[PDB]
């Protein structure tokens, strides 16, 4: 049930001339290039966002509470109070160490922490990133330590290797008595996304209690919540059931910049590709103006047979929208095909360049993710179709102003 | 009426249907190229502005390049300040460096040591908090920790530390005993950057590492982002060159890669505008076949009718690139001058800009080159066909 406005104007696109096939190829390539890259860029950004919640948000505590320069004596009462908060899912005690590793004629800046192995799997996904067979051998009094992949690569050490690391001497009298070293054997290693690998290590909580010569006392409470984007507020009221003041800190101040640098890239790319499509729309304007002044005889014929102004005005709108739609669909197909196989394409390109980008030293990850959503493809197809309709509007209006009698009808 | 018969035969063809819309279609390629250049210039200028701030807060506060000796330390007598005249250098001062490990009464930390002469000026001098640079005297073993380094170490003025050098440890035959001393702090420096957590300033004379010589000469650079080009010049014999590409070797390599990626993404506008010229010229060739044939019959060689359509694209590309460069050099400068007419971002950081004169010229020349290159096929097709056997 095709309408007369479109009628058989698709057959009007079956024209013959000189080098007009190459013009059509350029027209369908220039507008398809700006969509196939926008689709894969938005899919790559969606993949980055998906990997951020699986490799950073799931392994980093959302909030941490610790008092001012004071060992805790009523930490259990504070844990009981913070356990019942409308918005906090779980909490666990931990100790912050700043001891350093010196073994193998190299120096490493590491932040050791002490967490309960039975409670460490209830608020984070770090247990799921252990390269070993299992971490269930974590107990108290066995000198067990686990480090990240970066530290293991720097020390060239493996599982079970004995390493002596620096430990601060927690002396009640503020002096510089002696440096402390304790030998620990590696109970496995874990590989993170590629940023916290060389700056994370943890030990059992009870071992850290003995290393500080401290009794039933911990330094910090880490908390995992449900809505991660309200962490700046959920830690404000969580620290209210305490003494006068302890500290307040969340992951927004240290990892919230990554989210701000994902939406910014999306907005920049969308604005940069709307320009690409709009410039490619001039290619439709020129080739439709040429069709208007080449099909002037048929316009006069239709006017003589009684076609109204609206029919002639709308014939070329759908004539241009078909050339735009073909290019858009060809771009959508390419963008979907490349997006679905982006991870192997980038890996194969990096093996051809020799040196690989997206390094695992200062970035967020070491690879290029790609998650395809069937809502950005619709949003870019609609944008391309709207830009094509806008481009093929003024020439269509000019086509309706052709005098049917000035040209011999 | 012009002496060049090629140009007069095309100048009148750049707009023949004077109308409120007909004339606009002929300028579509120029508008597209102008937009592609004005979008390629502004964004890369903003990235250059971020890069300048990053370099002025990291590279400008750390030793950019050092000239040392391959056999460990360098004797100043064998290589004085008069013996160094390397290109790109505007200041040379003795310095000692080393990746030392801290030791406080509460915790331990790491950091690079900068042993400097208290008499000479230092880039970190203005960012001092109640500390006199002349207090760093030999024998007293005074040390100035960073603002973010002493905050995490729980160290205030009047405390003591046990800075140890594992890299330059005196490897005695009786195992391994690291070289260490007892430094007393005199205050902290706050530079409001990332170097306040791993940098501390000490006197130039220190035997905590080796040997009365120095490790090397810290030399300043007018353009510290081109060390890879200055690292191959003729250095004095018996010397070695080191730079910041060992510590900050991936951070500033990331910025260049991100700039290249953003430029490649934005160059698609110019690439599509080049295709627009190909379309606009292929449409003109097939429509003006009779004119081409008549010119061929009148005595115009095919190599002239080729340039007739070549200029139709070249003049549009040049006038688009120049306008795009001029608009990009103005939009970036006036991005937030009168009002922040950007759709104000939720950052509140006074977005910096840095217009590089060479980069704008390079962009405008690549735009002209691609516009001229895209014209070859439409101009060649207008002369490859037979003049009279095709149409008349």
């Amino acid at each position: 049930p095709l309408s007369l406005l479109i009628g058989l104007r698709f057959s009007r696109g079956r024209r013959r001339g000189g080098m007009v096939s190459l013009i059509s190829v350029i027209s369908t390539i220039g507008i398809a290039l700006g969509v196939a890259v926008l689709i894969v860029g938005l899919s790559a950004m969606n993949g980055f966002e998906r990997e951020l919640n699986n490799r950073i948000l799931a392994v980093v505590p959302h909030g941490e509470i610790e008092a001012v320069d004071q060992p805790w004596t009523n930490w259990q009462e504070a844990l009981d109070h913070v356990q019942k908060v409308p918005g906090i899912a779980a909490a666990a005690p931990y100790i912050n160490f700043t001891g350093l590793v010196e073994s193998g004629a190299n120096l490493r800046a590491i932040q050791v922490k002490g967490v309960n192995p039975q409670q460490e799997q209830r608020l984070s996904a770090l247990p799921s990133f252990v390269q070993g067979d299992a971490w269930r051998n974590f107990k108290a009094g066995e000198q067990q330590i686990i480090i990240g992949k970066g530290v293991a690569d720097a020390l060239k050490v493996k599982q079970g290797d004995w390493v002596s690391i620096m430990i601060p001497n927690s002396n009640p009298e503020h002096k510089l008595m002696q440096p402390k070293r304790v030998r620990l054997h590696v109970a496995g290693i874990l590989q993170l996304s590629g940023q916290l690998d060389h700056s994370f290590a943890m030990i059992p909580l009870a071992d850290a209690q003995q290393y500080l010569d401290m009794g039933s006392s911990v330094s910090g409470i880490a908390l995992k919540m449900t809505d991660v984007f309200n962490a700046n507020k959920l830690v404000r009221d969580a620290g209210e059931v305490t003494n006068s003041y302890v500290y307040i800190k969340s992951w927004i101040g240290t990892y919230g910049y990554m989210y701000r640098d994902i939406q910014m890239i999306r907005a920049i790319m969308y604005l940069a590709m709307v320009l690409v499509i709009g410039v490619a729309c001039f290619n439709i304007v020129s080739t439709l103006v040429m069709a208007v002044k080449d099909k002037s005889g048929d316009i006069a014929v239709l006017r003589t047979l009684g076609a109204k102004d609206g029919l002639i005005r709308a014939i070329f709108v759908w004539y241009g929208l078909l050339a735009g739609l073909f290019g858009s669909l060809c771009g959508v197909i390419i963008g979907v095909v490349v997006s679905l196989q982006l991870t192997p394409i980038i890996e194969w390109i990096e093996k051809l360049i020799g040196h690989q980008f997206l390094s695992s030293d200062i970035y967020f990850i070491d690879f290029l993710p790609s998650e395809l959503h069937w809502l950005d493809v619709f949003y870019v197809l609609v944008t391309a179709l709207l830009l094509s309709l806008l481009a093929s509007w003024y020439p269509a209006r000019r086509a309706s102003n052709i005098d049917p009698a000035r040209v011999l009808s | 009426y012009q002496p060049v018969a090629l140009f007069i035969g095309l100048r009148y063809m750049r707009g023949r249907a004077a109308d409120r819309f007909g004339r606009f279609v002929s300028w579509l390629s120029t508008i597209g190229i102008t937009l592609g250049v004005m979008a390629l210039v502004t964004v890369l200028s903003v990235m250059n502005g971020f890069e300048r701030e990053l370099q002025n807060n990291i590279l400008g506060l750390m030793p950019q390049a050092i000239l040392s000796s391959e056999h460990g330390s360098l004797n100043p007598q064998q290589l004085p300040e008069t013996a160094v005249k390397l290109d790109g250098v505007n200041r040379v001062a003795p310095i000692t460096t080393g990746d030392v490990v801290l030791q406080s009464a509460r915790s331990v930390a790491v950091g690079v040591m900068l042993g400097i002469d208290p008499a000479q000026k230092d880039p970190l001098t203005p960012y001092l908090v109640n500390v006199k640079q002349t207090d760093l005297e030999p024998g007293k073993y005074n040390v100035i920790l960073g603002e973010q380094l002493a905050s995490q170490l729980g160290v205030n003025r009047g405390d003591q530390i046990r800075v140890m050098v594992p890299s330059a440890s005196q490897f005695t035959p009786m195992g391994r005993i690291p070289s260490q001393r007892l430094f007393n702090v005199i205050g902290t420096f706050a530079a409001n950057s990332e170097v306040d957590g791993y940098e501390m300033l000490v006197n130039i004379e220190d035997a905590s590492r080796l040997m009365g010589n120095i490790t090397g000469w810290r030399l300043w650079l007018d353009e510290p982002l081109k060390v890879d080009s200055l690292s191959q010049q003729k250095l004095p014999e018996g010397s070695k060159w080191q730079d910041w590409r060992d510590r900050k070797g991936e951070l500033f390599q990331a910025v260049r890669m991100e700039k290249n990626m953003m430029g490649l993404l934005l160059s698609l506008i110019v690439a599509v505008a080049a295709f627009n010229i190909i379309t606009s010229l292929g449409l003109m060739v097939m429509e003006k076949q009779g004119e081409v044939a008549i010119l061929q019959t009148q005595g115009l060689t095919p190599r002239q009718i080729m340039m007739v359509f070549m200029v139709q694209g070249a003049s549009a590309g040049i006038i688009g690139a120049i306008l795009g460069a001029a608009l990009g050099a103005l939009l970036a400068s006036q991005l937030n001058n009168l009002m922040p007419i950007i759709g104000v971002l939720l950052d509140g950081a006074a977005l910096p800009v840095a217009i590089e004169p060479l980069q704008v010229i390079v962009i405008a020349l690549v735009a002209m080159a691609i516009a001229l290159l895209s014209t070859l096929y439409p101009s060649w097709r207008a002369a490859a066909t037979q003049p009279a056997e095709a149409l008349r």
Binding site: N232, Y247, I248, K249, S250, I252, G253, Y257, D261, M264 | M47, F50, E51, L54, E194, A254, V255, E258, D347, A349
Partner: peptide
């Protein structure tokens, strides 16, 4: 990337 603000929360 190359955009650092360095805003800390107390």
């Amino acid at each position: 990337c190359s955009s650092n603000a360095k805003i800390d929360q107390l």
